[PDB]
Amino acid sequence: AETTLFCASDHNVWATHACVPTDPNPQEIHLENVTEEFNMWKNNMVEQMHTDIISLWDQSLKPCVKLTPLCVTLQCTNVTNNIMRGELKNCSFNMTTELRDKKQKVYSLFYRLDVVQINSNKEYRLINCNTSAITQACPKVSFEPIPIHYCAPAGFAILKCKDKKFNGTGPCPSVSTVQCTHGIKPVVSTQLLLNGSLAEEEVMIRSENITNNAKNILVQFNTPVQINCTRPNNNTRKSIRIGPGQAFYATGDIIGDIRQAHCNVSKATWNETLGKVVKQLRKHFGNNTIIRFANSSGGDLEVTTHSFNCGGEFFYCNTSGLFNSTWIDSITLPCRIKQIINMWQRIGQAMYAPPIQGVIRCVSNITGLILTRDG
Amino acid sequence: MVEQMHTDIISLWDQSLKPCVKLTPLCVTLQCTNVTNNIMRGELKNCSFNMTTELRDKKQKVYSLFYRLDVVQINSNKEYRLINCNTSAIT
Amino acid sequence: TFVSVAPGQTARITCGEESLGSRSVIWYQQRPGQAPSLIIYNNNDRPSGIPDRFSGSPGSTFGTTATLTITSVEAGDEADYYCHIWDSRRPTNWVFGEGTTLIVLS
Amino acid sequence: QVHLQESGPGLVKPSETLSLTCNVSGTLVRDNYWSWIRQPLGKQPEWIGYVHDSGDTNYNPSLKSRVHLSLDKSKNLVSLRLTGVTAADSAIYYCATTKHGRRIYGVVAFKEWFTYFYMDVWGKGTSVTVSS
Amino acid sequence: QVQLLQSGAAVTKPGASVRVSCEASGYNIRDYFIHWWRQAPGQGLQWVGWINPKTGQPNNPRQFQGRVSLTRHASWDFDTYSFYMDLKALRSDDTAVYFCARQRSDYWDFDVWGSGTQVTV
Ligand SMILES: *[C@@H]1O[C@H](CO)[C@@H](O[C@@H]2O[C@H](CO)[C@@H](O[C@@H]3O[C@H](CO[C@H]4O[C@H](CO)[C@@H](O)[C@H](O)[C@@H]4O)[C@@H](O)[C@H](O[C@H]4O[C@H](CO)[C@@H](O)[C@H](O)[C@@H]4O[C@H]4O[C@H](CO)[C@@H](O)[C@H](O)[C@@H]4O[C@H]4O[C@H](CO)[C@@H](O)[C@H](O)[C@@H]4O)[C@@H]3O)[C@H](O)[C@H]2NC(C)=O)[C@H](O)[C@H]1NC(C)=O
Ligand SMILES: *[C@@H]1O[C@H](CO)[C@@H](O[C@@H]2O[C@H](CO)[C@@H](O[C@@H]3O[C@H](CO[C@H]4O[C@H](CO)[C@@H](O)[C@H](O)[C@@H]4O)[C@@H](O)[C@H](O[C@H]4O[C@H](CO)[C@@H](O)[C@H](O)[C@@H]4O)[C@@H]3O)[C@H](O)[C@H]2NC(C)=O)[C@H](O)[C@H]1NC(C)=O
Ligand SMILES: *[C@@H]1O[C@H](CO)[C@@H](O[C@@H]2O[C@H](CO)[C@@H](O[C@@H]3O[C@H](CO)[C@@H](O)[C@H](O[C@H]4O[C@H](CO)[C@@H](O)[C@H](O)[C@@H]4O)[C@@H]3O)[C@H](O)[C@H]2NC(C)=O)[C@H](O)[C@H]1NC(C)=O
Ligand SMILES: *[C@@H]1O[C@H](CO)[C@@H](O[C@@H]2O[C@H](CO)[C@@H](O[C@@H]3O[C@H](CO)[C@@H](O)[C@H](O)[C@H]3NC(C)=O)[C@H](O)[C@H]2NC(C)=O)[C@H](O)[C@H]1NC(C)=O
Ligand SMILES: *[C@@H]1O[C@H](CO)[C@@H](O[C@@H]2O[C@H](CO)[C@@H](O)[C@H](O)[C@H]2NC(C)=O)[C@H](O)[C@H]1NC(C)=O
Ligand SMILES: *[C@@H]1O[C@H](CO)[C@@H](O[C@@H]2O[C@H](CO)[C@@H](O)[C@H](O)[C@H]2NC(C)=O)[C@H](O)[C@H]1NC(C)=O
Ligand SMILES: *[C@@H]1O[C@H](CO)[C@@H](O[C@@H]2O[C@H](CO)[C@@H](O)[C@H](O)[C@H]2NC(C)=O)[C@H](O)[C@H]1NC(C)=O
Ligand SMILES: *[C@@H]1O[C@H](CO)[C@@H](O)[C@H](O)[C@H]1NC(C)=O
Ligand SMILES: *[C@@H]1O[C@H](CO)[C@@H](O)[C@H](O)[C@H]1NC(C)=O
Ligand SMILES: *[C@@H]1O[C@H](CO)[C@@H](O)[C@H](O)[C@H]1NC(C)=O
Ligand SMILES: *[C@@H]1O[C@H](CO)[C@@H](O)[C@H](O)[C@H]1NC(C)=O
Ligand SMILES: *[C@@H]1O[C@H](CO)[C@@H](O)[C@H](O)[C@H]1NC(C)=O
Ligand SMILES: *[C@@H]1O[C@H](CO)[C@@H](O)[C@H](O)[C@H]1NC(C)=O
Ligand SMILES: *[C@@H]1O[C@H](CO)[C@@H](O)[C@H](O)[C@H]1NC(C)=O
Ligand SMILES: *[C@@H]1O[C@H](CO)[C@@H](O)[C@H](O)[C@H]1NC(C)=O
Ligand SMILES: *[C@@H]1O[C@H](CO)[C@@H](O)[C@H](O)[C@H]1NC(C)=O
Ligand SMILES: *[C@@H]1O[C@H](CO)[C@@H](O)[C@H](O)[C@H]1NC(C)=O
Ligand SMILES: *[C@@H]1O[C@H](CO)[C@@H](O)[C@H](O)[C@H]1NC(C)=O
């Protein structure tokens, strides 16, 4: 059956304060002798969680500032630097003040991915002006994934399959009953599952059909690969009052050197992690195949790069060096930050992540991949 | 019961203000003279401003008596603005 | 700038503009009537023969002007003091800084 | 002990190619970098350019299009031939053994570094002046 | 109704590039991958590759790696969806008719195809 699962948990986007207090010691009842037929690819819990995450993202953005005024022609020069590195543009514009009959000449550092050139060669505009309306994310609500336990109502139950080697579907012996799922962090990302739950026995390959290319191959790691980010720019913020009781937090001067952001992955671990992955893939594809790993074929920035949210800033890491081997000391992946983010593949609901002050760092754990085979 | 009543009163105040007019245009520079009086009693200011009309491409010169507590002086000595323009939006 | 310090004191000679990024300022001393000479490169590293009294402000700080501190000033230290700033966030500076004539009251 | 002795005419006609040379002893011209430094009287020194044999040659952008530096091994000379001489070129010209160093402030793979050139032992100086 | 309007036949030379457009309309373009196929003269069909309309992620076989480029462009509100197929190192071998079809389930049922575009080199 399918029901409305509610949340349970121990200033956040996913409204975790509103959740029911979870049981300090969850009660798990190992059911004996019972075999149940699972199917992870027709799970209604997944679609319901997708709807819940989208709804929470929408409700967190409801009371925040609307940056409709910010869509104007911007006189952009390069940030003061010697050096490509056009990655930051010092853009000046006439913003509306608290008084409707006055205007102020203000400036802001905008990433190059957030501004497109119009026409006069110095005139720019935000990327979203010709497709969407932009809503500044509130500076006080955090994007940090807090674990969420999905509990079913009374009269329903959740069946956890404890079988370590779970292909994903079909009959699973050693079933158990739980009142809530484990803490599932809502971590949005592409090309790599971060801060996830790990397999216990082996690396696990799970695809709806391993013959259909359109179906992604979810890889789960038995051991995590630690990934360390830094946004080395200091990036102070600055409030510009765009209207009565409405502020716009814009990047000001950078305190230090203009350095490319990145995330590092250990080479000796990521190799032999791909070793386990190629062993488990050769299980499905025969022993004589040559399991090559190439980088992203193309598409949007959200799927050509390992996209994610780190320290409140939205990173897009190249990961061309990760997915490099034939398979018969760190790997610095350069990442680009964006502030105009269109989550959930939508249009009309873009948002402006305010600039974070200081220096951001990730310490995440790659616990899987989302691969795609070439036909 | 006291905290719940506080929440209820605030929520009712919010919901009663939800469908009403937003005076975002009213935050502008106001040319304020004293109301016609002999007489302190600066308690009322006759303030004139260019308000938006029904048509977005037209403007109207209108006036209004504003209490002195509701207007602060900017800068030109006759130029004023509503007290809330630099801190809040008024409904 | 004509910063004058009596001998045996500590002299502070600042030069250049406010730091923007990671900087490697190179200090030069020009005694009157001879060619310039090197004192500090990479903000604190002196070649052989230069005494340890010469010290430079770190280039790892942003928002601080380049300074040269000279402890126990002597008549040898009587000279003009130029700075060659190499900022990461500025183009190459092809002219030295405005020199400061240190005057020893001896 | 590296000895540098710069030789020049001492006076040059305006609009005529000034030329200088830097006799070197104790070191070979091919080994290290070589820079010239033009100090106008009463003004700060100016870095007019540096030259190397591997291909590293860079001159001041203001003095560019009128300057050329050459390294002659046969006589151990550094020749600076500043065409288009004008009134402001009156100055003391020095010759120096430039030494380079890398200031690294980030990831070297991302080219987050730069080469700073500090001038080691100089010469003496030739005070070239321009007049009719 | 569901329609995949293709572009007119184009002529190029060996080395030049060709673009084939597949303006799609009449349905939710997002939920259905768009596949490109190639009918050589007097031969069977050949799989050029699919493009995801949501993310834009392309997928081509080993033959067309570094050679073909599947792109898309959605107008306002995603109502229209122009799918482009680009070729770079074009040869006389690649003279064929390029069809664009709509995969409509996991079975790879291409219930709708394009009119066709005769690329002659
Ligand atoms: C992912 O992995 C990659 C690697 O694969 C990581 O990449 C690294 O990124 C680092 C920056 O984030 C970068 O760090 C720098 O390295 C420089 C070189 O250090 C090495 O060489 C020098 C000799 O040249 C050795 O001494 C040293 O031991 C190393 O071998 C340093 O120059 C940098 O430190 C200096 O600058 C920074 C930036 O401002 C300062 O914070 C720091 O304090 C240092 O500044 C002092 O020292 C310099 C010396 O040149 C002076 O010029 C300066 O004025 C300062 O002076 C003080 O200290 C000196 C001490 O000598 C003293 O005399 C003076 O009085 C002052 O007290 C900087 O540390 C790595 O090199 C780079 N690694 C690579 C590419 O291999 C990446 O970060 C990782 N990402 C993550 C973790 O997310
Ligand atoms: C601000 O940014 C500028 C660039 O905009 C930096 O100036 C550059 O500095 C680098 C490093 O010194 C220079 O690169 C060097 O150039 C040589 C290549 O040829 C040059 O000269 C010819 C003739 O004029 C030109 O055609 C050509 O374009 C180049 O200008 C090489 O010889 C050098 O190689 C060095 O490194 C290798 C490392 O393997 C060594 O083996 C070599 O021996 C040698 O040391 C080097 O690549 C570059 O030319 C400069 N550009 C300009 C425009 O001046 C500044 O350093 C930077 N300043 C800061 C941060 O203060
Ligand atoms: C995967 O999980 C890891 C943790 O397991 C996570 O890294 C963590 O990121 C958070 C981001 O919030 C870091 O917490 C921040 O750390 C610094 C230093 O204390 C502070 O700047 C932050 O506090 C300020 O900002 C907060 C909003 O971000 C405000 O709520 C707060 O009041 C302050 O203004 C904040 O504490 C945390 O330190 C790291 N963990 C580490 C380094 O171990 C990572 O981001 C996750 N990855 C993904 C993709 O989700
Ligand atoms: C997957 O890895 C590929 C390499 O294996 C990357 O391909 C590289 O992409 C670069 C950026 O598009 C190309 O640089 C461009 O080259 C063209 C042709 O010479 C120039 O016109 C462009 O100016 C130049 N771009 C810039 C910014 O200067 C590289 O040439 C190209 N390398 C190869 C070997 O083809 C893919 O980009 C990469 N894909 C992803 C999604 O990361
Ligand atoms: C971005 O550009 C602005 C100008 O649009 C810079 O602000 C100026 O900075 C200079 C140099 O310090 C000052 O003399 C001016 O008074 C500033 N003008 C202003 C604030 O209107 C600003 O420094 C630049 N920011 C960067 C490169 O981060
Ligand atoms: C991701 O990184 C790769 C390299 O790891 C980039 O490919 C390089 O592109 C530059 C030009 O930008 C070329 O000069 C190099 O030769 C390329 N390297 C290789 C190994 O092919 C790639 O461009 C990066 N991705 C993006 C989207 O920029
Ligand atoms: C407030 O000031 C307005 C003008 O801004 C006054 O209106 C004017 O009154 C005089 C005298 O009766 C008339 O001749 C003008 O035609 C009026 N002008 C208008 C309506 O634009 C108004 O009387 C003042 N109100 C007070 C003191 O209450
Ligand atoms: C500004 O950046 C552009 C790249 O966007 C670059 O081509 C140009 O040379 C830069 N201009 C200056 C004056 O630095
Ligand atoms: C801001 O307004 C002034 C009015 O004089 C105009 O000159 C300037 O170009 C405007 N700037 C922008 C970015 O539109
Ligand atoms: C797991 O699922 C796949 C799905 O294709 C099925 O074919 C396979 O037999 C299952 N394997 C095991 C070991 O249960
Ligand atoms: C960022 O800049 C602030 C001043 O704006 C400074 O205090 C702080 O130390 C810097 N952060 C670093 C170096 O991480
Ligand atoms: C990640 O960061 C931590 C920070 O302490 C460091 O100890 C660890 O070695 C890093 N791992 C990698 C793979 O860079
Ligand atoms: C990874 O390990 C394999 C197996 O030992 C080895 O052949 C290969 O060179 C290593 N490196 C890469 C990049 O695959
Ligand atoms: C990708 O692999 C090639 C060899 O196939 C190698 O030369 C290249 O440097 C690699 N690129 C990376 C790690 O970015
Ligand atoms: C992976 O990283 C998190 C911190 O980001 C850490 O708490 C967790 O224990 C790590 N996982 C494993 C299996 O060590
Ligand atoms: C108007 O009122 C002010 C006080 O706000 C008073 O000082 C001033 O004299 C008055 N002017 C006239 C013309 O009545
Ligand atoms: C109203 O607009 C007119 C336009 O001529 C101007 O002269 C007058 O000062 C404006 N009044 C205010 C209060 O801004
Ligand atoms: C919006 O602007 C971009 C950049 O100019 C352009 O390519 C695109 O066609 C426009 N329309 C939409 C719907 O994105």
Author numbering:
A (entry chain A): 48 to 57, 66 to 138, 150 to 185, 187 to 309, 312 to 323, 323A, 324 to 396, 412 to 458
B (entry chain C): 100 to 138, 150 to 185, 187 to 202
C (entry chain I): 5 to 6, 11 to 66, 66A, 66B, 66C, 67 to 95, 95A, 95B, ...
D (entry chain G): 1 to 82, 82A, 82B, 82C, 83 to 100, 100A, 100B, 100C, ...
E (entry chain H): 1 to 121
Sentences from the paper on this structure:
The human immunodeficiency virus-1 (HIV-1) envelope glycoprotein (Env) trimer is the sole target for virus-neutralizing antibodies (NAbs) and, therefore, is a major focus of vaccine research. HIV-1 Env, a class I fusion protein, is synthesized as a gp160 precursor protein, which is then oligomerized, extensively glycosylated, and cleaved by the host protease furin to form pre-fusion trimers composed of three gp120 and gp41 subunits. The function of the pre-fusion trimer is to engage with cell surface receptors (CD4 followed by CCR5 or CXCR4), and then undergo conformational rearrangements that drive virus-cell fusion. The initial, and most commonly used, design of stabilized trimers is referred to as SOSIP. These trimers contain an engineered disulfide bond between Env positions 501 and 605 that covalently links the gp120 and gp41 ectodomain subunits, and an I559P substitution in gp41 that reduces the propensity to adopt the unwanted post-fusion conformation.
We determined high-resolution structures of BG505 SOSIP.664 and BG505 SOSIP.664-dPG in complex with bNAbs 3BNC117 (CD4-binding site [CD4bs]) and PGT122 (V3-glycan), at resolutions of 3.0 Å and 3.2 Å, respectively. As expected, each trimer was fully occupied by 3 copies of the 3BNC117 and PGT122 Fab. The reconstructions of the trimers have similar topologies to ones previously published. A close examination of the gp41 region of the wild-type trimer near the site of the dPG change showed that all three gp41 subunits were similar; the structure of this region was resolved from residue Q562 onward (note that portions of HR1 are typically disordered due to the I559P helix-destabilizing mutation). The resulting SOSIP.664 construct yields stable, pre-fusion, native-like (NL) trimers, at least for some Env genotypes such as BG505 (6–9). Helix-breaking changes in HR1, such as I559P in the prototype SOSIP design, impede the transition of gp41 into the post-fusion form.
